[PDB]
Amino acid sequence: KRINIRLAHPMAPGNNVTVGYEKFKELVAEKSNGRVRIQLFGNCMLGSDRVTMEAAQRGTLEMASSSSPNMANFSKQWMVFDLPYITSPEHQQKLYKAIDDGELGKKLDEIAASIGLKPIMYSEYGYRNFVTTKKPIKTADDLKNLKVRTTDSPIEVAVAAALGMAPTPISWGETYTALQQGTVDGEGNTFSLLNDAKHTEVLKYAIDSAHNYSMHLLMMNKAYYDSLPANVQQILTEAGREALTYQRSITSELEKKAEDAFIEQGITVTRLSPEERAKLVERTRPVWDKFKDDIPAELIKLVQETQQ
Numbered sequence: 470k471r472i473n474i475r476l477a478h479p480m481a482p483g484n485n486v487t488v489g490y491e492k493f494k495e496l497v498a499e500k501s502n503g504r505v506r507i508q509l510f511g512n513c514m515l516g517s518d519r520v521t522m523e524a525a526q527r528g529t530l531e532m533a534s535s536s537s538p539n540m541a542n543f544s545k546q547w548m549v550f551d552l553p554y555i556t557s558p559e560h561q562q563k564l565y566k567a568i569d570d571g572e573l574g575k576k577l578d579e580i581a582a583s584i585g586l587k588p589i590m591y592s593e594y595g596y597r598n599f600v601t602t603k604k605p606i607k608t609a610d611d612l613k614n615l616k617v618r619t620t621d622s623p624i625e626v627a628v629a630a631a632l633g634m635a636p637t638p639i640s641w642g643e644t645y646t647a648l649q650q651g652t653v654d655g656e657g658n659t660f661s662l663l664n665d666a667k668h669t670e671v672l673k674y675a676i677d678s679a680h681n682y683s684m685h686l687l688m689m690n691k692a693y694y695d696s697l698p699a700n701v702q703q704i705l706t707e708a709g710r711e712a713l714t715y716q717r718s719i720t721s722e723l724e725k726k727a728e729d730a731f732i733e734q735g736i737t738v739t740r741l742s743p744e745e746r747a748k749l750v751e752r753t754r755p756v757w758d759k760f761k762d763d764i765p766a767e768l769i770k771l772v773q774e775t776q777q
Contacts, residue, residue, distance in 0.1 A: 471503070472701065476687070477510045477521035478534040485661060485723050486534065486592050486685045487511050489716030493590065493687075496708035505704055507532075525690050526585045534687040536594060538622045543584050547686075548760065549768045551624040553631075553753035556682050556776060558596060564775045565717065569710065573771040587694040589709040592685035593720040600663060600675045600736075601655035602648050607676065607739045609748035618644050618656040625657070627756045628680060632749070645671065657681065660727035661720075669731060675738045678749055 476494070480486040494507035515521050515530065518539045524530035526543065540547040549555065556564055567573040568591050581588050599606060599617070606612060613633035619625045621638050629636035639647050647653045648671045656668070657680065663669055687709065694702060731738055741749070757769075 472505045473508060474531045475508050476532040477515040477530055479513050479518045481512050485720040488719055489592050489712055492712040492715050493708050496712055497704060500704045500708055505701060525688055528690045528692055531693050532689045534685050536685055537683045540686055544580060545763050546580050549764050549772055550682060552757055553628045553680050554750045555772055560776045567775045582691055585691055586688040587691045589689050590687035590713050593717045594683040594685045595659040596679040597657045597659055597681040598675055599657045599678045600672045602671050604654055606674050609745050616654045618653045627759060628753050631753050631756055660731055661723050664727040664730045669734050672736055675736055677740055
C-alpha cells in the first residue's frame with residue numbers, strides 16, 4: 470500500500486531549494502514505482518521554518534527543511550557553518566564530499582539524532598554578499614559606519630560590528646521599506662534572494678564578500694525513519710543524495726542568472742581584490758574566538774579540513 474510523506478518548507482515556487490525538493494519528490498516516486506509519495510508543502514503552507522521543524526522533531530510531521538542558522542535554535546552546534554570565512558566557494562566540492570560521505574557528515578548525523586532527526590538533504594542555500602542602496606562599496610573600509618540590516622543571528626551581528634558597520638535586526642518583511650525609506654543603508658544576502666524579492670529595485674552596489682555560508686537542512690523525524698522498511702529507508706536516502714546533486718548545480722546556475730539580473734539593472738558588482746578579501750577575513754576572525762566556547766573545536770576542524 471501507498472506511503473504518504475509530508476515535507477514542509479519555507480521557500481517559494483522556483484526557488485533553488487524548492488526545485489531540489491521537487492526533484493526529491495520525483496525521484497522518490499520513480500524509485501518506489503509509486504509506493505512512496507512525497508507531498509510538498511512549500512512557501513510556509515504548514516508553518517514558518519521553526520513551526521514546521523518543531524513538528525518534524527516532535528513527530529507530527531514526517532519531514533521539514535530549516536536553514537542552518539535556524540537549526541542553531543534547536544542545537545547550537547550547527548553555528549559552525551555560519552562562522553565568517555570558515556568556507557569559501559573555491560573549496561565547495563570538497564565540502565560537499567565531506568558532508569556526503571565523510572566524517573563531517575557522520576558527526577552531523579549524530580548531532581541530528583540527539584534532537585530527534587535524520588538528515589536527508591543538505592540543500593545548498595549559498596554565500597551572502599553585502600549590498601547597498603546609495604553608498605559605493607568596493608573596499609573593506611567602504612563598509613565602515615554602514616547601517617546594515619541583519620537577521621536575528623548573533624554571528625551575523627558580530628560580523629557586522631567587527632567590520633565597523635552598525636547592525637540593525639529587521640524582519641525580512643520590513644527590509645524593503647527600511648532600504649527604500651533609508652533606515653538602513655544596506656544588507657547582506659544571496660544575489661538570488663535579493664533579486665527574487667525585488668530588493669534590486671532599491672540597490673545600487675554589491676561586493677562578492679561571501680562572508681556567510683548556509684544550507685537548507687531537510688530532516689526526517691528519526692523515529693519515523695527508523696519505523697520504515699529498509700528498502701524505503703534506502704529509497705529516501707538515495708533520492709536525497711541524487712536530488713542534491715541536481716540542486717547544487719541548479720543553485721549555481723540560478724545565482725549566475727541572479728548576478729546577470731543585477732548587472733542588467735545597473736547595479737555595480739565589485740569583485741574584491743585579494744588584498745581587500747584578506748582584510749574582511751582578518752577583521753572578522755575575532756568573531757570565532759568570541760563564540761569559541763559555544764561551538765565544538767572538533768567540528769571547526771572537520772569543516773576547516775575541507776578547505777585545505
